[PDB]
Design a protein around this nucleic acid. Structure first.
Ligand code: CA
Ligand code: CA
Ligand code: CA
Length: 247
DNA sequence: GTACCTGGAT
DNA sequence: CATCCAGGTAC
C-alpha cells in the first residue's frame, strides 16, 4: 500500500514551498535538485536507494519540459558496455575524448547528423531484455550486444521507485543569480518493469546514453559517463502509473 | 576510470 | 516531437 512516511514527506515539501525563491546551491542544470536536497538537510549521495525513507523525490522545472530521469543503470552485458559504446560509436570532443550522447527510442531509429551511427531499442518480450541496436549509416544493424535484463531494471524500480514524489518548480535569473521556486508535488506510483518497457517500446520513455566529459574541477577533460538513464515524458505519466496531488 | 547520484537548452 | 548535453561523489 502506502508509505508510513507520506505525512512527514508532505510537511518537508511544504516547508520548502513556503520558502519561496531559493538561490541555487550549485551552478548548472543539477542545481534545481541539489538546492532542494540542501533545503531538506540531505547530504548528496550516490546510492540507488530512495531519498526520504522509502520515497523517491525528484524536482522538475515545468517550463523546461525536460524528460524526467527515473534512474540510471549500466547494461547487464557485455562487461564494459558503455566504454565499448564510447570507443566504437562516439565522436571526438574538444579534449580528444570520444563522447556519446544519444536519446534512444523503441519506436524509431535516431537520425543523428553529428554521429556516424544510429540507435534504436528493441524490447524483447520473449527473452525479457531491453536491447540496444546500433546501425551504420547504410542502415545495417552492426551491433546488438548491449542489453539490460528485465530483472535488473525491476531490481532498480523495487529499490528506488515504489513512490515517486515529483516536485514541480520554476526558475529565474535575477541580479546575475539563479533562483528556484518549488510549487507543488504529485506522487507517481505503480511504475512496473512491464509499464516501463511498454513506454520504451511506444516512445514515451527513453533510454538515454549520456557519455560526456568533465568541464571543470580536478577531472577537467576526462570522460564523464553520467550513467545510462531511463527517462519519461512528463506528459505521459498517467499511461504508466497512477498520479495524485500531494502538496 | 566505472557506475551511481542530481538534472536541462535548443 | 528530436538532438545533444550539464555538475556531483564512492570506490
Ligand atoms: Ca537519491
Ligand atoms: Ca531523487
Ligand atoms: Ca520486440
Amino acid at each position: 500500500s502506502m508509505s508510513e512516511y507520506l505525512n512527514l514527506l508532505k510537511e518537508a515539501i511544504q516547508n520548502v514551498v513556503d520558502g519561496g525563491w531559493h538561490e541555487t546551491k550549485r551552478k548548472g542544470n543539477t542545481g534545481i535538485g541539489k538546492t532542494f536536497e540542501d533545503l531538506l538537510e540531505k547530504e548528496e549521495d550516490n546510492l540507488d536507494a530512495p531519498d526520504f525513507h522509502d520515497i523517491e523525490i525528484k524536482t522538475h522545472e515545468t517550463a523546461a519540459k525536460s524528460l524526467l530521469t527515473l534512474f540510471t543503470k549500466s547494461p547487464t552485458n557485455p562487461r564494459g558496455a558503455n566504454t565499448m559504446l564510447r570507443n566504437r560509436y562516439g565522436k571526438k570532443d574538444e579534449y580528444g575524448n570520444n563522447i556519446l550522447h544519444q536519446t534512444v527510442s523503441g519506436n524509431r531509429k535516431t537520425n543523428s547528423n553529428s554521429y556516424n551511427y544510429d540507435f534504436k531499442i528493441d524490447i524483447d518480450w520473449e527473452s525479457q531484455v531491453v536491447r540496444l541496436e546500433v546501425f551504420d549509416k547504410q542502415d545495417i544493424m552492426i551491433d546488438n550486444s548491449v542489453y539490460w535484463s528485465f530483472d535488473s531494471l525491476q531490481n532498480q524500480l523495487d529499490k528506488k521507485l515504489k513512490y515517486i514524489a515529483v516536485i514541480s518548480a520554476e526558475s529565474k535569473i535575477e541580479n546575475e543569480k539563479k533562483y528556484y521556486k518549488y510549487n507543488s508535488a504529485n506522487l507517481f506510483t505503480d511504475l512496473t518493469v512491464q509499464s516501463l518497457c511498454r513506454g520504451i517500446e511506444n516512445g514515451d520513455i527513453k533510454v538515454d546514453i549520456r557519455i560526456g566529459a568533465y568541464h571543470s574541477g580536478k577531472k577537467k577533460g576526462k570522460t564523464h559517463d553520467h550513467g545510462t538513464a531511463f527517462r519519461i515524458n512528463m506528459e505521459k505519466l498517467l499511461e504508466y502509473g497512477e498520479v495524485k496531488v500531494i502538496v
